[PDB]
Amino acid sequence: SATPHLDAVEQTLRQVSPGLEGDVWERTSGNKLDGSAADPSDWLLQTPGCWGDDKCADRVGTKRLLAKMTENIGNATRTVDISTLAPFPNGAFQDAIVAGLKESAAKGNKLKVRILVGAAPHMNVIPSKYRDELTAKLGKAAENITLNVASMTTSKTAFSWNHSKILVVDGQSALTGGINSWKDDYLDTTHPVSDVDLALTGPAAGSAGRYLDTLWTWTCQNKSNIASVWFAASGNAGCMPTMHKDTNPKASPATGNVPVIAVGGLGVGIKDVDPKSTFRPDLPTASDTKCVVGLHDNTNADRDYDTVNPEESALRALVASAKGHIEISQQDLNATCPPLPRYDIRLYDALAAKMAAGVKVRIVVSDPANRGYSQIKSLSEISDTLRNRLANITGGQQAAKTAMCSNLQLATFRSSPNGKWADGHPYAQHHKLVSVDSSTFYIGSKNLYPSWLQDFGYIVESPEAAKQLDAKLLDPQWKYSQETATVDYARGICNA
Numbered sequence: 001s002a003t004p005h006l007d008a009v010e011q012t013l014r015q016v017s018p019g020l021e022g023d024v025w026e027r028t029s030g031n032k033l034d035g036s037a038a039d040p041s042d043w044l045l046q047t048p049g050c051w052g053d054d055k056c057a058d059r060v061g062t063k064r065l066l067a068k069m070t071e072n073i074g075n076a077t078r079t080v081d082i083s084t085l086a087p088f089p090n091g092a093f094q095d096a097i098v099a100g101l102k103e104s105a106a107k108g109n110k111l112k113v114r115i116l117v118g119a120a121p122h123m124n125v126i127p128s129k130y131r132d133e134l135t136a137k138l139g140k141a142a143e144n145i146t147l148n149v150a151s152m153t154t155s156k157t158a159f160s161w162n163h164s165k166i167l168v169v170d171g172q173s174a175l176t177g178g179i180n181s182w183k184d185d186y187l188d189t190t191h192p193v194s195d196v197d198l199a200l201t202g203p204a205a206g207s208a209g210r211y212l213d214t215l216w217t218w219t220c221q222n223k224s225n226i227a228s229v230w231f232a233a234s235g236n237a238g239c240m241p242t243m244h245k246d247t248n249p250k251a252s253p254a255t256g257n258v259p260v261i262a263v264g265g266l267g268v269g270i271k272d273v274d275p276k277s278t279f280r281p282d283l284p285t286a287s288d289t290k291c292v293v294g295l296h297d298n299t300n301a302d303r304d305y306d307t308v309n310p311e312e313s314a315l316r317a318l319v320a321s322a323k324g325h326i327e328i329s330q331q332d333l334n335a336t337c338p339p340l341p342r343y344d345i346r347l348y349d350a351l352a353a354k355m356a357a358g359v360k361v362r363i364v365v366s367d368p369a370n371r372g373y374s375q376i377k378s379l380s381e382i383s384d385t386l387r388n389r390l391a392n393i394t395g396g397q398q399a400a401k402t403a404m405c406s407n408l409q410l411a412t413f414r415s416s417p418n419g420k421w422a423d424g425h426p427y428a429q430h431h432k433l434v435s436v437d438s439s440t441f442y443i444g445s446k447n448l449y450p451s452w453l454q455d456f457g458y459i460v461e462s463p464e465a466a467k468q469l470d471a472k473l474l475d476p477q478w479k480y481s482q483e484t485a486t487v488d489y490a491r492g493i494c495n496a
């Protein structure tokens with residue numbers, strides 16, 4: 001096969017979540033990574049993109065991200081479909097959205113627009129305030145636009161709400177990844193968060209539209225339930241649960257030859273199980289993930305949860321598909337317990353199995369000196385766990401340590417020679433990135449640390465794009481980050 005990695009992931013998803021195929025996950029052909037003619041790797045919307053400079057003077061990444069938001073929206077003829085994590089877009093992110101909408105409206109187009117945020121759960125005025133602010137900023141363009149704005153919470157007790165970050169235009173183009181539209185963390189700061197989105201076009205953008213219809217179908221159904229949904233619309237417009245299906249082709253036009261698996265999850269409180277699923281997982285055991293006995297562990301101990309959250313299985317299957325090497329860049333691999341379990345056992349088992357077979361694993365996480373942008377005190381909380389899982393399959397602890405130190409790179413993130421930004425603040429990293437075999441990679445919103453949220457992303461099998469990702473992001477990341485490594489097989493470092 002030309003697509004061995006996607007083939008394996010696809011087979012897993014059809015066993016885990018067959019009833020969600022089309023809507024919460026979908027394999028498509030005919031896509032394109034949407035880079036420019038001058039810089040074809042600039043589909044890779046990293047921010048800030050100021051490698052080597054502790055003052056981050058020339059933020060080529062940020063500039064491209066904001067320009068690409070405006071460009072895609074300004075090309076809209078029918079729909080603009082946005083999700084993110086609250087707060088609603090502000091600063092230059094909002095400026096970019098407004099500029100795009102005005103550009104489309106002046107080109108004569110009449111648009112339907114949805115903007116959905118997830119938030120922690122009386123009289124939430126935020127959606128209505130954002131609607132009215134956007135309408136004022138649009139000026140005459142507002143006459144051409146039907147707007148829906150909502151904040152939603154699907155489960156208070158499971159801490160479940162939207163955390164996908166998607167921008168889809170006409171079902172044709174999509175931007176997605178880790179980037180929240182938060183000016184203070186990403187833009188107006190001398191210690192910007194490092195993160196990444198991708199830009200694509202093709203049928204896979206339609207998959208994102210169908211995912212958003214799934215979320216908006218729930219949101220609209222629950223719009224009268226305060227505490228679940230706060231909704232606001234322009235004029236006398238109603239809630240649009242199926243804007244994508246209603247307005248855009250069932251299969252978007254083809255734009256290239258790139259195969260993609262779109263995959264998300266429904267978190268907790270939308271749908272409890274895929275009734276079509278006959279998935280029968282072999283669930284591992286551990287004694288050090290559920291920190292307290294009363295916690296219901298959806299990540300490790302709930303078969304039904306898996307069936308409505310195919311993204312967890314997809315990421316584990318992506319790791320399991322690697323023949324040569326795996327690079328992982330995350331805010332965290334481990335979560336804060338309670339209320340989440342500390343780690344995904346199946347994930348750590350999949351990484352252990354790869355290392356036991358001589359496949360190289362690199363994990364770069366955010367510096368613990370950031371502890372919202374870190375959830376561990378020490379890299380040992382990752383390496384100890386990998387070693388203990390390795391012990392189960394290598395026959396003991398000494399053989400585990402040797403396997404780990406022979407096949408692992410483990411470090412915290414830097415983007416310049418300095419241990420911190422020049423302003424003295426630690427580097428914060430927020431990617432949700434997995435790349436394997438310089439072939440197939442995930443960019444999206446789904447963290448590898450336990451999390452029970454609505455998330456979304458793309459798994460792309462394209463060696464050319466993976467090589468661009470190496471050159472523009474993974475290679476410079478390791479150039480600077482390697483100085484913090486506690487384990488590095490390539491230099492014989494084993495301080496763990």
Ligand SMILES: *[PH-](=O)([O-])[O-]
Binds near residue numbers: 085
């Ligand atoms: P996310 O914005 O919580 O990872």
